[PDB]
Design an enzyme around this catalytic site. Structure first.
Site, PDB file in Angstrom:
ATOM      1  N   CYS A 212      14.508  46.262  19.867  1.00  0.00           N
ATOM      2  CA  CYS A 212      13.076  46.722  19.575  1.00  0.00           C
ATOM      3  C   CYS A 212      12.277  48.031  19.514  1.00  0.00           C
ATOM      4  O   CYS A 212      12.876  48.954  19.446  1.00  0.00           O
ATOM      5  CB  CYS A 212      11.966  45.735  19.899  1.00  0.00           C
ATOM      6  SG  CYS A 212      11.913  45.695  21.953  1.00  0.00           S
ATOM      7  N   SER A 213      11.231  48.417  19.608  1.00  0.00           N
ATOM      8  CA  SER A 213      10.772  49.103  19.909  1.00  0.00           C
ATOM      9  C   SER A 213      11.240  49.809  21.814  1.00  0.00           C
ATOM     10  O   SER A 213      12.177  51.170  22.305  1.00  0.00           O
ATOM     11  CB  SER A 213       9.422  49.358  20.737  1.00  0.00           C
ATOM     12  OG  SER A 213       8.858  51.005  21.105  1.00  0.00           O
ATOM     13  N   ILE A 216      13.556  45.557  25.780  1.00  0.00           N
ATOM     14  CA  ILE A 216      12.968  44.383  26.558  1.00  0.00           C
ATOM     15  C   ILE A 216      12.559  43.016  26.040  1.00  0.00           C
ATOM     16  O   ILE A 216      12.301  42.201  27.075  1.00  0.00           O
ATOM     17  CB  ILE A 216      12.431  45.563  28.508  1.00  0.00           C
ATOM     18  CG1 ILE A 216      11.859  46.292  28.118  1.00  0.00           C
ATOM     19  CG2 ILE A 216      13.687  46.373  28.169  1.00  0.00           C
ATOM     20  CD1 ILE A 216      11.056  46.856  28.879  1.00  0.00           C
ATOM     21  N   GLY A 217      11.321  43.880  25.931  1.00  0.00           N
ATOM     22  CA  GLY A 217      10.375  42.833  25.800  1.00  0.00           C
ATOM     23  C   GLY A 217      10.768  41.619  24.257  1.00  0.00           C
ATOM     24  O   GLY A 217      11.382  40.644  24.615  1.00  0.00           O
ATOM     25  N   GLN A 256       8.333  40.665  29.148  1.00  0.00           N
ATOM     26  CA  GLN A 256       7.597  41.320  29.368  1.00  0.00           C
ATOM     27  C   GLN A 256       6.054  40.786  29.037  1.00  0.00           C
ATOM     28  O   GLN A 256       5.013  41.017  30.562  1.00  0.00           O
ATOM     29  CB  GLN A 256       7.030  42.571  27.968  1.00  0.00           C
ATOM     30  CG  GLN A 256       8.057  43.999  28.033  1.00  0.00           C
ATOM     31  CD  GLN A 256       7.927  45.378  27.734  1.00  0.00           C
ATOM     32  OE1 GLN A 256       7.415  45.635  26.514  1.00  0.00           O
ATOM     33  NE2 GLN A 256       7.780  45.679  28.237  1.00  0.00           N
TER      34      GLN A 256
END
Ligand SMILES: CCc1oc2cc(S(=O)(=O)Nc3ccc(S(=O)(=O)Nc4nccs4)cc3)ccc2c1C(=O)c1cc(Br)c(O)c(Br)c1
Length: 276
Positions: A212-213, A216-217, A256
């Protein structure tokens, strides 16, 4: 009612989603990540507080700097292995495709938009039209072969070409474009099992690249739900907290927010129900 459904209701009525996530944060082990903090690797990290562990990071073979912000998340009990990485920077797009080639990766899973809330979360590492995208640093080119636009996601068929050897590989680019967490796991599960239907997560291929960005989230939500669903097909009564803590040993900070943790619980429950 299953054990996971019993636990999910207990956390819902008692409102224990935030202390449960605090427990997962406190029980998360920290591992050395020295290579990520090298001064030469500063421009290769999108975020300062997100780094791959030294023991699980993916290495760029036969390069001057072998570092890339990517982690190999291995789950042997589920026979699953994903590569969770950050959104490539303009200067790391060449390394991103070098990693995809070296790891024999068949599919890339993108769970974020290019821009989000007035901010660029990921560079445009694949072409949008018929023009070839060159990466002279690693000797690769990417061409857009096909595109299937759906309601919440888009599937891009890409051609990864080694410009020095002429060898080409077809990569399936699954791009989830409507991540807010979603109120219902129906869209997320149908996107996940569309990735499953392509055979991209099968053991006869290299590890799929989830990102994603920060990687991890939303990527942790994708990997946790997919791994737990595989563990349920094996007839195993899983501990979602222990499975998540085990995956957090390969990459820091998976999941997250408590809402992402609660959505993972919903997707696992509804996903196992759709098989029934
Ligand atoms: C397991 C993956 C998955 O999980 C889902 C969950 C939902 S949901 O959140 O609405 N929940 C739900 C929806 C329906 C049921 S149900 O079991 O009552 N109905 C059906 N099950 C199978 C076919 S019709 C139980 C739970 C919707 C859709 C899906 C879905 C899919 O879209 C999907 C299912 C299969 Br099987 C498949 O091969 C692919 Br591809 C996608």
């Amino acid at each position: 009612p299953t054990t996971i459904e019993r636990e999910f209701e207990e956390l819902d009525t008692q409102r224990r989603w935030q202390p449960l996530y605090l427990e997962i944060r406190n029980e998360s082990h920290d591992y050395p990540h020295r290579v990520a903090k090298f001064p030469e690797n500063r421009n290769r990290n999108r975020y300062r507080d997100v780094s791959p562990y030294d023991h699980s990071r993916v290495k760029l073979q036969n390069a001057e700097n072998d570092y890339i912000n990517a982690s190999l998340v291995d789950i042997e009990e589920a026979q699953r292995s994903y590569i969770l990485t950050q959104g490539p920077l303009p200067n790391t797009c060449c390394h991103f495709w070098l990693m995809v080639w070296q790891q024999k990766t068949k599919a890339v899973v993108m769970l974020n938009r290019i821009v989000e809330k007035e901010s660029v979360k990921c560079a445009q590492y694949w072409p949008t039209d018929d023009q070839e995208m060159l990466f002279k640093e690693t000797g690769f080119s990417v061409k857009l072969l096909s595109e299937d636009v759906k309601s919440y996601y888009t599937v891009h068929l890409l051609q990864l070409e080694n410009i020095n050897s002429g060898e080409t590989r077809t990569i399936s680019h699954f791009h989830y474009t409507t991540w807010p967490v979603p109120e219902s796991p129906a869209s997320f599960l149908n996107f996940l099992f569309k990735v499953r239907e392509s055979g991209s997560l099968n053991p006869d291929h290299g590890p799929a690249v989830i990102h994603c960005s920060a990687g991890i989230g939303r990527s942790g939500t994708f990997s946790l739900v997919d791994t737990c669903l595989v563990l349920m097909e094996k007839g195993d009564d899983i501990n979602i907290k222990q499975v998540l803590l085990n995956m957090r040993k390969y990459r820091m900070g998976l999941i997250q927010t408590p809402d992402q943790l609660r959505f993972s619980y919903m997707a696992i429950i509804e996903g196992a129900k759709c098989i029934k």
